[PDB]
Design a protein around this ligand. Structure first.
Ligand SMILES: O=C(COP(=O)(O)O)N(O)CCCCOP(=O)(O)O
Ligand SMILES: O=C(COP(=O)(O)O)N(O)CCCCOP(=O)(O)O
Ligand SMILES: [Ca+2]
Ligand SMILES: [Ca+2]
Ligand code: NA
Ligand code: NA
Ligand SMILES: [Zn+2]
Ligand SMILES: [Zn+2]
Lengths: 307, 295
């Protein structure tokens, strides 16, 4: 059933596994994510960014989710606002029926981030919805990066301790070296697992990893075979995602992998039959590929069979 | 708001216009259809086939439509089961919240068709939803006006789909387009109810061109000319099933995006243009059929 996000992540935190948080922009993505959760018997964060809410309309985002939850009442699901940018946006999401909201003010100074985050928390908690906030910048720590300029980019763990204590945020996204999109690393992947472990120790709450797509070999292969361009793309290795969970990550934001898998099949159908214009013949294989990405990720993070 | 199909077709029937009935299989198609209705101030028949209902889940088909009706409360909308094949399928639709259902037993003997249709009509009318049935082969083999007269009186169906020369899909005519408008008018005279044209896509020139420019193949395809559609409405057609045109327009833009940027994998970048092309096909059709500005 639809539940507050912190009910799902507190279980993950205590039992030491990670729960995939999967973005959707329409029916096909949503359906495939839910079918994956049903087949793997796994809890789920379903998320929509502000741009996805603009695309769908917030009434439709929430609406489709509630219908899916009624279809599969046994699956614990949190409906989560991804990268909320203002108090007002988080407020609209609460009113609309989201059960978790991210207020992302990581680009603001520490005092402003904490102030805005605390304001959202007071509002959300009053409505019985959980809150995520973020510290650090979601960009790659390039090689030859200043030893100090690294501490000006990644999460400052002492900041994280105070941040969580004063804001009462339910979960925290600490930047440890990932970033959004298909182009995460020039050269070999590297994440600050020491930093992660220090944050987990200091805060003792569920933590969130953004930019956690892996760009699996089979997915890259499907996209390339269908004539797509992924030159220079590098995701977070499966081994790193498991290490992240060991280090205290409980929510794993995954969006890019889903879209590559999905669009690879759309491109393939278009390539292989020029006369095809039944939408379902494009979107059925696309759904299956996305579903399969989600199912494998659920097993990897250890959320499979945790319902 | 969401209304029984007869509310919409009776007005169209009395005032002599046609109302486009547009199929959807997901959110993008449904949103573009509704935005068309909003921009041309037109009533809407939104339909889902048995196949589309399997694809979406009937719970999602109805749910999405109701959300859209709440988004655009001024637009009269009928939610219609296209090509129901059994009593059971029609009943599920009534129970799920459809406000219109087609029971299609056209391929059966006249007697079986009338029998099954009368059963659906009894259940549906009991629940306040309208019913469409079909007579004739959509490809003698066309509707028999005297059969239609009897079929309508005994079955009490709200609207009828008489076969007059159309058929589904992009390949409607080997040669020149022809419809039996004489047959249409006789059916209209003898039944005096709203009539439904299936296989009504036109495959417009701009849509065909967008599809071919995008690498698609439409060799040999031919739809119902705009002029013939207008002649159909004049002859008594009030519901005009349109599906193929929307899909070609939509998929043309999807193909184009795939062609022009191999690195693009944001779904919205594919489906935003596809929605706009679909919306524009539907807007023009609303104007053509005369349902524009009827709100
Ligand atoms: O951390 C992530 C995903 O990480 P990933 O890119 O590795 O999958 N997320 O927060 C999801 C990304 C949201 C962006 O979507 P919009 O373009 O609609 O704003
Ligand atoms: O009459 C028509 C459409 O006519 P058109 O093909 O000229 O647009 N309709 O009844 C629509 C047919 C819908 C079929 O879709 P499925 O494949 O899901 O069964
Ligand atoms: Ca941020
Ligand atoms: Ca038939
Ligand atoms: Na988030
Ligand atoms: Na129909
Ligand atoms: Zn993110
Ligand atoms: Zn039809």
């Amino acid at each position: 059933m639809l539940v507050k996000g912190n009910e799902i992540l507190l279980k993950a935190h205590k039992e030491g596994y990670g729960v995939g948080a999967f973005n959707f922009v329409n029916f096909e993505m949503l359906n495939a994510i839910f079918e994956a959760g049903n087949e793997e018997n796994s809890p789920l964060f379903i998320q929509a960014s502000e741009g996805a809410i603009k695309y769908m309309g917030i009434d439709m985002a929430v609406g489709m989710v509630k219908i899916m939850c009624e279809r599969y009442p046994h699956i614990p699901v949190a409906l989560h606002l991804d990268h909320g940018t203002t108090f007002e946006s988080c407020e609209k999401a609460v009113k609309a029926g989201f059960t978790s909201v991210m207020i992302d003010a990581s680009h603001h100074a520490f005092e402003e981030n904490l102030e805005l985050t605390s304001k959202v928390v007071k509002m959300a908690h009053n409505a019985g919805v959980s809150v995520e906030a973020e510290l650090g910048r979601l960009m790659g720590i390039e090689d030859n990066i200043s030893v100090d300029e690294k501490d000006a980019v990644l999460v400052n763990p002492k900041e994280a301790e105070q941040f969580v204590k004063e804001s009462q945020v339910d979960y925290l996204a600490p930047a440890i070296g990932t970033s959004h999109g298909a182009f995460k690393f020039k050269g070999e992947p590297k994440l600050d697992f020491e930093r992660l472990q220090e944050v987990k120790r200091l805060t003792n709450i569920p933590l969130v990893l953004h930019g956690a797509s892996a760009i699996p070999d089979n997915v890259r292969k499907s996209y390339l075979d269908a004539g797509g361009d992924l030159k220079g793309s590098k995701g977070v290795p499966f081994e790193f995602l498991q290490e992240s969970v060991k280090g205290g990550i409980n929510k794993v934001n995954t969006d890019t992998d889903l879209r590559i898998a999905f669009i690879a099949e759309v491109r393939k159908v278009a390539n292989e039959d020029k006369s095809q214009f039944d939408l379902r013949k494009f979107f059925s294989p696309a759904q299956l590929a996305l579903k399969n990405v989600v199912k494998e990720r659920m097993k990897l993070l250890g959320s499979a069979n945790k319902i």
